[PDB]
Design a protein around this nucleic acid. Structure first.
Ligand SMILES: [Mg+2]
Ligand SMILES: [Mg+2]
Ligand SMILES: [Mg+2]
Ligand SMILES: [Mg+2]
Ligand SMILES: [Mg+2]
Ligand SMILES: [Mg+2]
Ligand SMILES: [Mg+2]
Ligand SMILES: [Mg+2]
Ligand SMILES: [Mg+2]
Ligand SMILES: [Mg+2]
Ligand SMILES: [Mg+2]
Ligand SMILES: [Mg+2]
Ligand SMILES: [Mg+2]
Ligand SMILES: [Mg+2]
Ligand SMILES: [Mg+2]
Ligand SMILES: [Mg+2]
Ligand SMILES: [Mg+2]
Ligand SMILES: [Mg+2]
Ligand SMILES: [Mg+2]
Ligand SMILES: [Mg+2]
Ligand SMILES: [Mg+2]
Ligand SMILES: [Mg+2]
Ligand SMILES: [Mg+2]
Ligand SMILES: [Zn+2]
Lengths: 122, 110, 42, 53
RNA sequence: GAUGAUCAGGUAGAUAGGUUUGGAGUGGAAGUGUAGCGAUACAUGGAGCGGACAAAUACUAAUCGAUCGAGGACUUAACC
RNA sequence: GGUUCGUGGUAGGAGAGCGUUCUAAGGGCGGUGAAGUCAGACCGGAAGGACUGGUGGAGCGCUUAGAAGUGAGAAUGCCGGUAUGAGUAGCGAAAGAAGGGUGAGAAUCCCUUCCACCGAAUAUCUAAGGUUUCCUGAGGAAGGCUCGUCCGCUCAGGGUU
RNA sequence: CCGAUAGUGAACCAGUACCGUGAGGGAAAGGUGAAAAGCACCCCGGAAGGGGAGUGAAACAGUUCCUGAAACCGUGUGCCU
RNA sequence: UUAAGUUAGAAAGGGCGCACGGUGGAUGCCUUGGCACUAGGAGCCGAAGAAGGACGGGACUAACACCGAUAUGCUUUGGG
């Protein structure tokens, strides 16, 4: 596994941040090294989502960030990243064995030449 | 016959401009522009503007065919150096040359 | 802690115009800086 | 620690024989008609040369 | 394996990721129930979890391109 | 004009000269191109001197004499310029991420959310000291150890009861 | 007698800038053209900067702009490796 | 064809020569400023407030020069 120029705790925070971003936005632009680590972590969260039971929900909850995605309105209740992962994202990969993400190479970033990519669900 | 453009006293070290200019010397302008677009260096954008200026000069001033142009000459000349100082340990100051470039591109038919 | 701990008052009391004028040697200094044509006496 | 002799022009130039860039790996797209890095998405068309987005 | 390089692969596909099944390892998950005033214990159940290990699986990515690279000097001898 | 004997050389003695600036007198060159500068395969025993051509664009040789701030390769010389080391050391304690925006251009400016750090401080006052750095609007040459649309930077207006 | 490293420290806003608590120390820095006639207009570029066009005797005189050596940096290539 | 032998060519880069540029500010020419003198003049100012300053004064004024709330000038006599 990649150390991404970060200590152990910094790297777990980064992975949780990006994993949540990809679940919430469904398409993010990041560095190639980050994307190649994110696909592993996001595909395991979607697997948990597909498992669907309380034990899996609580394993996902230990990882996903407590972010509001939207406010839907029935009274208007917020939708949390965890709810989106178990109700929106996971169900749409019910007949797809794995391979929930794809990485499109984009090109180098101006300020540091970092190789940037799009990582997206599908 | 040929068309030249120059970018005088661009604030980039000549060595840094030359390592890129060396990729486009002799190429067809279409390929030259692609090479610059996909060479991730600070000099690439600067050299691209000189090259596209040279091509506009060739199309507007000398009615030449832009589809048939090659980079005949490309070179970087030293411009005037800005002299700066960096404070170092023990009160000593060390010189810093903020060097500048003159970037010339000549395009020609073939 | 460096030499030069500024004090507006101490600067004028030690080096100011009225202190220079208060002694003969102080006046020699003013005369000398006028002779050299300094913008700033004291 | 310090250079014993200044380096001559010839020796400096020989040292720099290998300090150079390579040409980027690129080719003309079919749909776009313009150059693109292989295994990258083409912005001219606005997507991956093959896989439409 | 510092980088180059080397080696395994590029859909003529198991090269990597995922997925599924294992394994090591840990040592009995959550939820629920039962007993107990309670701390807790027991059951469900060698459970749950499980980086890098194993095997299967083309789900994701190895698309599409381009570049380089022979046409073989003369003399003599021997066969011929 | 011959003959004879000579002609290695440091310190050093002796001699004859070259060239530089200026002065005088004479005689010249020069916008049909002076000095300077660049180039060349020319001339003299040396110091040196011409010629031709380019550049240059207005002054300068020559002869004889005179006078000197009169000749540089070395002084860890002085001043300036430019190399070499080298695309090397360094970029000054630290947690960021993505989305949205702006813009010619964005890791670096703005906004949002999450994350992280200080918390007898890395918070709030306030003396000293600084002196306009404060606010607003423009800007992006230089400064900012990168970038920059941003700034304690530049330019305008303002602002202290 | 000097002719911009000279001649005053100072040909230029100089005892300035700058350094120093202070006494005090103390620089660098001259030249577009006869005349601004200081480059309308077009083109590439955000600009800078260029290329044309024009002015001019000249712009390779383009607002620091007479001349423009050498070091040093490059491009090209006749012979060699 | 085989064998034995001989010789060419090559440039990643480099060297020498030449050409053309860049940088840089030497040189020449130039002079706004200096240096040394000569002849003449003059050799003091200040409580009637000096030397030297600070702050101001312009339609807009950052600096210089000039001026002092009569402030980028006022009165007068001459010149022009
Ligand atoms: Mg920890
Ligand atoms: Mg210090
Ligand atoms: Mg101080
Ligand atoms: Mg395998
Ligand atoms: Mg002998
Ligand atoms: Mg002898
Ligand atoms: Mg003698
Ligand atoms: Mg002369
Ligand atoms: Mg010259
Ligand atoms: Mg001398
Ligand atoms: Mg010397
Ligand atoms: Mg080294
Ligand atoms: Mg190193
Ligand atoms: Mg380093
Ligand atoms: Mg830092
Ligand atoms: Mg404490
Ligand atoms: Mg502010
Ligand atoms: Mg910068
Ligand atoms: Mg700003
Ligand atoms: Mg002087
Ligand atoms: Mg001069
Ligand atoms: Mg001086
Ligand atoms: Mg100039
Ligand atoms: Zn395309």
């Amino acid at each position: 596994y990649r150390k991404l120029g970060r200590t152990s705790s910094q790297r777990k925070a980064l992975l949780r941040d990006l994993a949540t971003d990809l679940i919430v936005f469904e398409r993010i632009e990041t560095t190639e090294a980050r994307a190649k680590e994110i696909r592993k972590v996001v595909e395991k969260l979607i697997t948990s989502g597909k498992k669907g039971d309380l034990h899996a929900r609580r394993q996902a909850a230990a990882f996903i960030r407590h972010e509001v995605v939207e406010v839907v309105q029935v009274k208007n209740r917020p939708v949390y990243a965890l709810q989106k992962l178990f109700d929106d994202v996971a169900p749409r990969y019910a007949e797809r064995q794995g391979g929930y993400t794809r990485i499109l190479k984009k090109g180098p970033r101006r300020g540091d030449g970092a190789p940037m990519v799009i990582i997206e669900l599908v | 016959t040929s068309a030249k453009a120059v970018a005088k006293t661009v604030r980039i070290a000549p060595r840094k401009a030359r390592i890129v200019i060396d990729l486009i010397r002799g190429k067809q302008v279409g390929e030259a522009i692609a090479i610059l677009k996909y060479t991730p260096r600070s000099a690439s954008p600067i050299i691209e503007k000189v090259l596209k200026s040279a091509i506009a000069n060739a199309e507007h001033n000398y009615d030449l065919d832009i589809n048939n142009l090659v980079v005949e000459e490309a070179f970087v000349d030293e411009g005037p150096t800005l002299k700066r100082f960096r404070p170092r340990a023990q009160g000593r100051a060390s010189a810093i040359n903020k060097r500048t470039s003159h970037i010339t591109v000549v395009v020609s038919e073939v | 802690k460096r030499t030069y701990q500024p004090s507006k008052r101490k600067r004028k009391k030690v080096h100011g115009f009225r202190t220079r004028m208060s002694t003969k040697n102080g006046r020699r200094v003013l005369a000398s800086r006028r002779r050299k044509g300094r913008k700033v006496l004291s | 620690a310090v250079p014993f002799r200044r380096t001559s022009k010839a020796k400096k130039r020989k040292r720099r024989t290998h300090v150079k860039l390579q040409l980027p790996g690129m080719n003309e797209c079919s749909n776009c008609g313009e150059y693109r890095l292989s295994h990258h998405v083409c912005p001219e068309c606005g997507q991956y040369d093959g896989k439409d987005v």
